[PDB]
Paper text:
The cancerous inhibitor of protein phosphatase 2A (CIP2A) is an oncoprotein found overexpressed in many types of cancer. CIP2A has been shown to stabilize oncoproteins such as cMYC by shielding them from PP2A-mediated dephosphorylation. Here we report that phosphorylation of Ser904 creates a mode-III 14-3-3 binding site in the C-terminus of CIP2A.
For structural analysis of the interaction, a CIP2A peptide representing the C-terminal amino acid sequence was cocrystallized with 14-3-3σΔC. The space group was determined to be C2221 with one 14-3-3 monomer in the asymmetric unit. The 2F0-FC density map allowed us to build five amino acids of the peptide sequence. Analysis of the crystal structure reveals a typical mode-III binding motif. The binding of the peptide is primarily mediated by the polar contacts between Lys49, Arg56, Arg129, and Tyr130, consistent with most 14-3-3 binding partners. Additional polar contacts are mediated by Asn175, Glu182, and Asn226. Studying the C-terminal amino acid sequence of CIP2A reveals that it contains a putative mode-III 14-3-3 interaction motif (x-x-x-[pS/pT]-X1–2-COOH), in which phosphorylation of Ser904 is a prerequisite for 14-3-3 binding. Additionally, concentration–response curves generated with peptide 1 confirm that the interaction is phosphorylation-dependent, as the nonphosphorylated peptide does not interact with 14-3-3. However, the affinity of the complex is low, with an EC50 value of 118 μM.
Author numbering:
A (entry chain B), D (entry chain B): 901 to 905
B (entry chain A), C (entry chain A): -4 to 231
């Protein structure tokens, strides 16, 4: 999955 | 509001307890109560707010994806008809998710953003506004889809403009904003080249500023830089 | 009830969806609705009911333990006074936990147990009754503590009596009942020797019956036997 | 912790 914060 | 009778400090204390107990819905309700007291939020308080709703909406998004995948399979060639239940329950989760997003956006608009004057608070809140419009965009399928996407873009863009003027390239808020805006480009806006360019430029400019930092700041910044790198490795 | 307008079959279908989405509160509400239709539950339906509430109450119990530990520390020598917040929030979680236990016990009493005539359903429901009185007992501190404990014991004992008469020693319901009753002895009733004796005798009698089983039944039974063994290793 | 099922 795309990494977000 | 059900938290209107509790002291602000008690709400913050209980938010920290709920976090320790991994009770993120409680944590979010306590922090909503704290915001509604009307005073600005400290750095630590802003991060309690974001941690709480990030966990709540994160679980809803994961559940929505599970259900949307089941729903898409049921609409394939050769899939037996099973009635309205899958769609109904996906819709139920979707509606609760949208409600959480609307609640956060409501707190930002009444009145966190308009009172936020320091770069660290203003960029933080505008990143949040971009994030929660992005979560709305992930489930959007109707006439408002384009306006929802543009609301996410506009909030991210205002935050980027301020962060580039007012913050160093290694600032963790700036770095996380850039990470999420690059995800917006890749996942929402159908702009993978923009996503890749942003992540690379953000990473490289941070790399060149690391020498100014203490050991502890270096650890904070490199942690988020590694997330930029992980995305680039996935996307290229 | 909010589920009164939904078909029984649709409630069961959505409970299975909620499980896949790890939405256990939803799963529990759907199965509560299914029970309240008034028809007896199939084997698969009983296990959906138990899975859902086990996950809900399991998270509440874990949160309660975190908070109770913080509370106990605050009452040690040399601990700074922090006000009523820790106790209040432990009480909030405790009250919600008790509410879930009361809801389950209410379903069992109205009217699942009285309609359950086959050993597999009756033992299953009486194990559940013992389990949820045990969870009440874990948080009990008042005048009713002894009666709560005896209610757990009485339900477990009726289930044991039926299981020993009506089920083989390898039956997974019988084995899980014995596992949990041994935990009751160790953790609630201050009877570790009884706990150890029960676990050992249960394990040994199952071991001697494994030869009668198919490969798939052998796997089901040995899985629970290993939990008996793990407890014995912890307790001895 | 004690194992239950
Ligand atoms: Cl639904
Ligand atoms: Cl509380
Ligand atoms: Mg006050
Ligand atoms: Mg201000
Ligand atoms: Mg009907
Ligand atoms: Mg019957």
């Amino acid at each position: 999955v795309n990494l977000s914060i | 509001g059900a938290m209107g009778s509790m002291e602000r400090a008690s709400l913050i204390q209980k938010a920290k307890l709920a976090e320790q107990a991994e009770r993120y819905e409680d944590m979010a309700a306590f922090m909503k109560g704290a915001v509604e007291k009307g005073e600005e939020l400290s750095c630590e308080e802003r991060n309690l707010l974001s941690v709480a709703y990030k966990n709540v909406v994160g679980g809803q998004r994961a559940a929505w994806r599970v259900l949307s995948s089941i729903e898409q399979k049921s609409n394939e060639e050769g899939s037996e008809e099973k009635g309205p239940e899958v769609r109904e329950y996906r819709e139920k989760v979707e509606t609760e998710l949208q409600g959480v997003c609307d609640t956060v956006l409501g707190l930002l608009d009444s009145h966190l953003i308009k009172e936020a004057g320091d770069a660290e608070s203003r960029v933080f809140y505008l990143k949040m506004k971009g994030d929660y419009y992005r979560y709305l965009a992930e489930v959007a399928t109707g006439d408002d889809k384009k306006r929802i996407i543009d609301s996410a873009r506009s909030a991210y863009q205002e935050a980027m403009d301020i962060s580039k003027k007012e913050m160093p390239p290694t600032n963790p808020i700036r770095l996380g904003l850039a990470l999420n805006f690059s995800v917006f480009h890749y996942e929402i806006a159908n702009s993978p080249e923009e996503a890749i360019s942003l992540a690379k430029t953000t990473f490289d400019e941070a790399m060149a500023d690391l020498h100014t930092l203490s050991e502890d700041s270096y650890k904070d910044s490199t942690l988020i830089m590694q997330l930029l790198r992980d995305n680039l490795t996935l996307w290229t």
